[PDB]
Design a protein that fits this description.
The structure is cut from a larger assembly and holds five copies of chain A, one copy of chain B (140 residues), one copy of chain E (115 residues), two copies of chain F, one copy of chain G (69 residues) and one copy of chain I (262 residues). Helix content of chain B is 3%, strand content 49%. With 140 residues, chain B is mainly beta. Chain B is globular and about 40 Å long. In chain F, a hairpin with a 2-residue loop joins strand 10 (157-160) and strand 11 (163-166). In chain F, helix 3 (78-86) packs across helix 8 (191-210) and helix 7 (181-188) packs antiparallel against helix 8. The longest helix of chain F is centred in the last third of the chain and has 29 residues, at 362-390. The chains are: A alpha+beta (147), B mainly beta (140), E alpha+beta (115), F alpha+beta (391), G mainly alpha (69), I alpha+beta (262). The complex binds magnesium ion and zinc ion (2 copies). Chain F binds one RNA strand of 10 nucleotides through residues 32-33, 35-38.
RNA sequence: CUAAGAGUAC
């Protein structure tokens, strides 16, 4: 999950060659769906991606405090001064054919957390196993091979 | 095989609309005063401007010989002769409506893979058009 | 970096959650429902420390 | 750990973020479940 | 846990071959060839070099699932031209182009002095 | 599992990873996301239970819900957006991509359709390629607002004998709507053919979108200078009208609407003016958004978002409401100690005149926090009460 | 914990550019961006790899070792 | 902060000035010889005050000093703010970003988010994985999860260096692309 | 006759060149092979003898696996999976041993320069960790307080970037074609003007700008790809490109071989 | 800066916060 | 309500769900482990002797 | 093993 409530599981993992790549060969560490942006209105996710891009390029640290006088215009201007598209879009190439994508991809560093909820600790199946002593039903919980 | 229809139109309006590769043109026939055309053309691939004289033909097939789609499209081999060789811009579609505009005027609607065309005129020269597949051929 | 402010009970770190309660020695008046014969109720939860 | 050490629990419209919560408890920090609003963080 | 070994992407499994051909009955003179332990890298290359052929009517490929490294390539040629022959010619053309490129790049790198 | 469609018979496909995998469409009946959701799998232990499960509870048999005599599944998320991008008139596909998209349809008859354009370059339109997915023999004719038999706006939908004659394919056509493509296909050809149609459409559209790409970024939430100036002018005009209404109320010249008090009418008028202000600002922003705007594209496709999302992200977040009323005076006669007593101005009572692009002031941030708190509380209370009512 | 060997995205070996980075920051009084450019980190993937690393290992090295020989 | 009449300037101003800030900076730098100046010194000379929700009913607070204290071509990209057209302030917020809690002080640009998303992140950063203590090697706790390479955020807040977040980060800077790439 | 190359910049680790008269599919296939199909040597198996450090055993094993190793003659090695030895031998592996002790009162940095090859390399040019910096110390593998000791052994097999990214000798591969967007393969997102808002690439200087009046050239295909390959250090960047071409040729040759033998 | 009694800016208040957290800490209420 | 109207049952699994555009509408992806755990009893028939014998 | 409690996921 990002620092903006953008929780989600890994749908699939692609190697470096299959990922879309910019003209500088950078491939993303993550690909997130655009559809999470309009409904959830996590604009701060986009703004912090842009600010992180500017900070990584310029070597400074993004001042992402809530109520500062930091604007998207200033971050965009600083990014344009660094040789990139001001709004964070980058012309990317499809990793399977190399052809340019007809649409330019929003691209940049972003701060993500790995949460404690892993699939290895939630998968659970039981064809047959221990039963309950009282009602002769399967016991409860995956910690007991329950049903 | 043979041309179901042929005429020379002059384009009075070219409307880009919300598109960058397709424009809708309205054309008035310079020979018959009652025939008129509305047509979606790929301007990227065949530019069209206002007051441009276009020879417009509709055929049932492109081969020079008479008829003997259901057969798969195959890229034209070198040296293959078709009616398209005489024209610059050739599209293929199916007719999907024959509207009776007036007592003598009828309109025929063709759908060129989503590029819409409506050709209207007196039935004495549009009668050859029928509810089937047709090729639209255009030269400047 | 450890900040303290917690207990060690049987080798487990136990923290006391700040329990919220109504303040004492404050007079609070509340409107009651129409069916009840009382329309307003003024109360104090008096206590001496 | 820090949020736990600064956690407040309200025994049980107390769930609403009151105006008086300004600057004394976090405006948006509370569980999504049945504890929403009852558990607050300073 | 359930994550399979990485080497299964590029290593041939027991009892299966790199190539398998099944004739396609939808159109005449058409085959579907399943390439095993491959990916888009070979797929797009072979597709393009098949489409450069004049006598190949249809040539396309698809990776049916990203989980498994394998892809299906359908080839339909003109009558009197075995689609296997089209695959042979496309592979030959790819090899020749790559060899010419390797020679050219070697000769171009030998021309540098600041290396 | 609130209804019978939330419990359906599927076919096992064994996969080499640790999660259940299901089609994107079939998530709509289950109300299932992929942000940590868990699902249950029951295996029948006899041929009889197996058989009646496959013949009564099969997913294709549940496509059309008895709940509203309309399909409960449709094309959603990326595919939906992709299909809108694929069926535009501008969308023309070269020979190689056409061959790949045709091969990606498992039941493609094996004949390449004659291209929509033959000279000087063979180009297939997106509608032509998508018509391969639609089964042969389907007739559909929907007329959108203002469409004619010719489509200047390419809206509407006309499909004749399985070929899309015209119309942009979007939520109204392939979505879970009555009379749409899903309903017509399942009622004419059968549930199996409808499931096959789902698979074919998703396959072709997802391939096209993979090789076309669709993104969204911060620039998609930005309106140009004149539009921002007009939005600010709209907000200022609304605030001036609110100030005039406040004057007329405070000068006692305001008359209470029949059936309510003076304060109730005043609050009603203020809330209405602020709501229509946010609506006008959002409409200005939406009109300003070009057709290439990614959020606009998603909204037009119907896959995700709406007008209000664009309004809040680009133009104005709007009025924050608690219990259906404006932000209440939690402190004595004032909402916060940062406002003087008896201040009924829009900013003092939760109106958020700043978009999410511009960011929120501290007071507006707190008022939005209160609004979201009410939203979460209402969500919990509503799910509990609805569960009890359903049982 | 300790500087990663390779940049996560591209894979440029940046585990050998941490002590040089610290020496540049300390002895030469260079700011972060100029030092990153000096070390050869031109892509912002590598620049974020080296810029935002937190050297926790120093902390771990303050405690007396559990097994001391 | 405490605000007094300040007849010398003729307008309301914070009781804290640049001299006290300089002394606090000197004390901090000495920690990182002059007379020590701590928060108790501000509390003792009437520089700062403690106000609770009972007293907070009868005060007026300035959100920021630079824009609300002085008496009255602007950047269109800046968010819209109001002046409140009133000068009767009694106290000043030390910083508005201090209304957030420990978990919500980690959010970058929380004012650029929908409030339920901020609540979700506040409840979700407690589930975040990082370094809970530097002496985890000598603690026999029941469960511990530690990132290999915790990175301090590229977009960092001013309130997260009091939480030692930069010392003990709970996440990584991943290069994210927002794209409908494969449908997965 | 065939693809033509003209290299702009030649460096020890970066080659920037132009790949003309070639199809897009071939250029992208070469790029992908260079990314993930070049065999390379990296530490694969780790036997931990002593570890009194603060880092976990598999943490240090992870760091060791990411150490680049010289792979000039990696084609002379064999894969351990198709070798006749029991676990690992000299014909299919290189054995290193990292032995460090914290005998200094200050922190002692265990670098990759202390990695010493144990197996006799039989005259090859493999095994050596790649050193790039001027100080001469390699990658900072670990740190030692006074009295801490870390003894371990590594078996290094040949590996490709597909099986694990630690074997990737490619780093970032810049790949671009048609900088002026003459093929119209992109629709430039813009607010007021696409030309102004999109910075011109450095490669725009190597092509003629469009005349702004000429009709769209629908017969124009994709060629003249500007490609910049970076070298991690395992193999020289020119050898990176050459081995990518070789491996792609080998893949197509294997396709032909299987086809002909069946 | 040069003026001892000049008004402070919005950046200055952070110093004050720092001083506060130098004396209180994050769990000062528990210990107190 | 706890043991008769609704009861804990065997032959059931539960885990996280992920999307897959390459699956049919009526298909569900089952992890290999869950397939290895959940079982179906198939009666031995002359028509399925070979495959069940091979599974054994 | 049972019971109670706390936190948490959708
Ligand atoms: Mg969910
Ligand atoms: Zn990098
Ligand atoms: Zn061996």
């Amino acid at each position: 999950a990002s620092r903006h409530g953008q929780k989600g599981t890994i749908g699939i993992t692609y190697r470096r060659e299959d990922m879309p790549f910019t003209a500088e060969g950078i491939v993303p560490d993550l690909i997130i769906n655009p559809h999470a942006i309009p409904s959830r209105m996590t604009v701060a996710h986009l703004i912090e991606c842009l600010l992180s891009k500017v900070a990584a390029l310029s070597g400074n640290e993004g001042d992402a405090s809530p109520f500062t006088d930091i604007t998207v215009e200033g971050i965009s201007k600083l990014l344009r001064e660094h040789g990139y598209q001001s709004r964070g879009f980058e012309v990317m190439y499809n990793g399977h054919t190399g052809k340019k994508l007809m649409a330019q991809i929003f691209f940049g560093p972003t701060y993500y957390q790995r949460l404690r909820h892993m699939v290895d600790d939630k998968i659970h199946a039981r064809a047959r196993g221990p039963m309950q002593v009282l009602t002769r039903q399967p016991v409860e919980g995956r910690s007991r091979d329950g049903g | 095989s043979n041309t179901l229809f042929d005429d020379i139109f002059q384009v009075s309006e070219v409307d880009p609309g919300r598109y960058n590769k397709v424009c809708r043109i309205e054309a008035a026939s310079t020979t018959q005063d009652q025939c008129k055309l509305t047509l979606d053309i790929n301007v990227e691939l065949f530019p069209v401007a206002a007051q441009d004289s276009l020879t417009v033909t509709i055929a049932s097939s492109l081969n020079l010989e008479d008829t003997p789609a259901t057969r798969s499209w195959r890229p034209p081999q070198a040296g293959d002769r078709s009616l398209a060789d005489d024209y610059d811009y050739v599209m293929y579609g199916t007719a999907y409506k024959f509207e009776e505009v007036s007592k003598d005027l009828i309109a025929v609607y063709y759908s060129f893979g989503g590029l819409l065309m409506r050709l209207e005129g007196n039935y004495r020269n549009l009668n050859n058009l029928k509810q089937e597949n047709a090729y639209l051929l255009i030269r400047r | 970096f450890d900040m303290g402010g917690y207990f060690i009970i049987n080798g487990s770190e136990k923290v006391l959650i700040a329990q919220e309660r109504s303040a004492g020695n404050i007079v609070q008046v509340f409107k009651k429902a129409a069916p009840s014969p009382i329309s307003h109720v003024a109360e104090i939860r008096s206590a001496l420390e | 750990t820090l949020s736990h050490l600064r956690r407040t629990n309200t025994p049980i419209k107390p769930r609403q973020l009151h105006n008086t919560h300004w600057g004394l408890v976090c405006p948006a920090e509370t569980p999504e479940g049945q504890a929403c609003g009852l558990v607050k963080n300073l | 846990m359930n994550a399979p070994d990485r080497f299964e992407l590029f290593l041939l499994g027991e009892g299966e071959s790199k190539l398998k051909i099944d004739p396609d009955t939808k159109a005449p003179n058409a085959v579907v060839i399943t390439f095993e332990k491959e990916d888009h890298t070979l797929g797009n290359l072979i597709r393009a070099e098949l489409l450069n052929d004049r006598k190949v009517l249809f040539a396309a490929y698809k990776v049916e699932h990203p989980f498994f490294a394998r892809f299906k390539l359908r080839i339909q040629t003109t009558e009197g031209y075995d689609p296997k022959d089209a695959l042979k010619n496309a592979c030959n053309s790819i090899i020749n182009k790559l060899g010419a490129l390797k020679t050219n790049f070697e000769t171009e790198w030998n021309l540098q002095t600041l290396a | 599992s609130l209804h019978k469609m939330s419990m359906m018979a599927h076919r096992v496909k064994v996969i080499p990873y640790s999660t259940f995998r299901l089609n994107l469409s079939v998530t709509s009946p289950y109300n299932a996301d992929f942000d940590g959701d868990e699902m249950n799998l029951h295996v029948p232990q006899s041929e009889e239970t197996r058989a009646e499960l496959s013949q009564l509870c099969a997913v294709p048999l549940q496509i059309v819900s008895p709940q509203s005599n309309k399909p409960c599944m449709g094309i959603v998320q990326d595919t939906l957006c992709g299909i809108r991008k694929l069926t535009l008139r501008d969308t023309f596909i070269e020979l190689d991509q056409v061959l790949n998209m045709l091969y990606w349809v498992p039941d493609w008859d094996g004949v390449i359709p004659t291209p929509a354009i033959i000279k000087p370059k063979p180009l297939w339109s997106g509608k032509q390629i998508l018509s391969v997915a639609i089964p042969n023999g389907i007739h559909l004719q929907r007329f959108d607002e203002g469409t004619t038999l010719l489509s200047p706006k390419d809206n509407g939908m006309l499909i004749i004998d399985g070929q899309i004659i015209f119309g942009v394919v979007e939520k109204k056509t392939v979505g879970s709507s009555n009379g749409g493509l899903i309903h017509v296909v399942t009622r004419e050809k059968g549930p199996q053919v409808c499931a096959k149609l789902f698979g074919n459409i998703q396959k072709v559209v997802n391939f096209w979108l993979l090789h076309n790409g669709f993104s969204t970024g911060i620039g998609d939430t930005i309106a140009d200078g004149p539009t921002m100036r007009e939005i600010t002018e709209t907000i200022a005009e609304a605030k001036k009208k609110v100030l005039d209404v406040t004057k007329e109320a405070q000068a006692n010249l305001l008359t209470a609407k029949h059936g309510m008090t003076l304060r109730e009418s005043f609050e009603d008028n203020v809330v209405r003016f602020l709501n229509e202000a946010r609506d006008k600002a959002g409409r200005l922003a939406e009109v300003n958004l070009k057709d290439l705007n990614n959020v606009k594209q998603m909204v037009m496709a119907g896959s995700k978002g709406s007008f209000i999302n664009i309004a809040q992200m680009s133009a104005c977040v709007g009025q924050q409401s608690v219990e259906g009323k404006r932000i209440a005076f939690g402190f004595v006669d004032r909402t916060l100690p940062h406002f003087s007593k008896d201040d009924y101005s829009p900013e003092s009572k939760g109106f958020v005149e700043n978009s999410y692009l511009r960011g929120l002031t501290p007071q507006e941030f707190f008022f939005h926090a209160m609004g979201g708190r009410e939203g979460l509380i209402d969500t919990a209370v509503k799910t509990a009460e609805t569960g009890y009512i359903q049982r | 914990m300790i500087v990663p060997v390779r940049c996560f995205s591209c894979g440029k070996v940046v585990g050998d550019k941490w002590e040089s980075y610290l020496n540049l920051l300390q002895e030469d009084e260079l700011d972060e961006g100029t030092a990153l450019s000096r070390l050869g980190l031109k892509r912002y993937c590598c620049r974020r790899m080296i810029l935002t690393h937190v050297d926790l290992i120093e902390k771990f090295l303050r405690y007396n070792p559990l097994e001391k020989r | 902060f405490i605000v007094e009449d300040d007849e010398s300037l003729g307008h309301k101003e914070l009781k804290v000035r640049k001299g006290h800030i300089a002394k606090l900076m000197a004390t901090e730098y000495q920690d990182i010889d002059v007379e020590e100046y701590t928060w108790s010194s501000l509390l003792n000379e009437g520089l700062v005050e403690y106000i609770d929700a009972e007293e907070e009913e009868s005060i007026l607070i300035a959100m920021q000093p630079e824009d609300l204290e002085p008496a009255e071509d602007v950047d269109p990209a800046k968010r819209i703010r109001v002046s409140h057209h009133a000068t009767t302030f009694t106290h000043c917020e030390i910083h508005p970003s201090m209304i957030l809690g420990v978990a919500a002080s980690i959010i970058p640009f929380p004012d650029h988010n929908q409030s339920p998303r901020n609540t979700y992140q506040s409840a979700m950063g407690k589930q975040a994985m990082g370094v809970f203590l530097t002496n985890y090697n000598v603690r026999m706790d029941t469960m511990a999860n530690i990132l290999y390479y915790p990175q301090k955020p590229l977009g960092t807040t001013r309130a997260m260096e009091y939480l030692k977040f930069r010392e003990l980060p709970a996440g990584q800077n991943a290069i994210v692309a927002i794209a409908c790439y494969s449908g997965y | 006759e065939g693809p033509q190359v003209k290299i702009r910049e030649a460096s020890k680790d970066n080659v920037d060149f132009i790949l003309s008269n070639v199809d897009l599919a071939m250029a992208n296939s070469l790029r992908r092979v260079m990314i993930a199909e070049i065999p390379t040597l990296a530490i694969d198996s780790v036997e931990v003898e002593t570890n009194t450090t603060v880092l976990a055993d598999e943490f240090i094993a992870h760091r060791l696996g990411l150490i680049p190793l010289q792979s000039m003659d990696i084609e002379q090695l064999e894969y351990s999976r198709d070798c006749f030895c029991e676990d690992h031998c000299d014909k299919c592996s290189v054995v290193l041993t990292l032995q460090a002790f914290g005998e200094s009162e200050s922190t002692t940095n265990v670098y990759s320069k202390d990695l010493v090859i144990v197996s006799n390399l039989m005259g090859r040019n493999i095994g050596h960790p790649i050193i790039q910096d001027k100080e001469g110390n390699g990658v900072l593998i670990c740190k030692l307080r006074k009295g801490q000791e870390l003894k371990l052994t590594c078996v290094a097999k040949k590996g490709i970037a597909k099986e694990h990214a630690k074997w990737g000798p490619a780093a970032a591969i810049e790949f671009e074609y048609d900088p002026w967007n003459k093929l119209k393969h992109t629709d430039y997102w813009y607010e007021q003007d696409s030309a102004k808002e999109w910075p011109q690439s450095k490669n725009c200087e190597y092509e003629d700008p469009p005349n702004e009046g000429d009709p769209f050239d629908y017969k124009a295909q994709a060629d003249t790809f500007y490609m910049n390959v970076e070298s991690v250090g395992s193999i020289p960047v020119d050898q990176v490109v050459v081995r990518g071409i070789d491996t792609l040729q080998k893949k197509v040759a294997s396709i032909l071989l299987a086809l002909t033998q069946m | 800066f040069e003026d001892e009694s000049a008004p402070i800016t919005a950046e200055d208040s952070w110093a004050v916060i720092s001083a506060f957290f130098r004396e209180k800490g994050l769990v000062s209420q528990q210990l107190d | 309500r706890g043991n008769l109207m609704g009861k804990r049952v065997d032959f059931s699994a539960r885990t996280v769900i992920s999307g897959d555009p390459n699956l049919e509408l009526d298909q569900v992806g089952v992890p290999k482990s869950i397939a290895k755990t959940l079982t179906y009893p198939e009666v031995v028939t002359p028509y399925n002797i070979d495959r069940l014998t091979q599974l054994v």
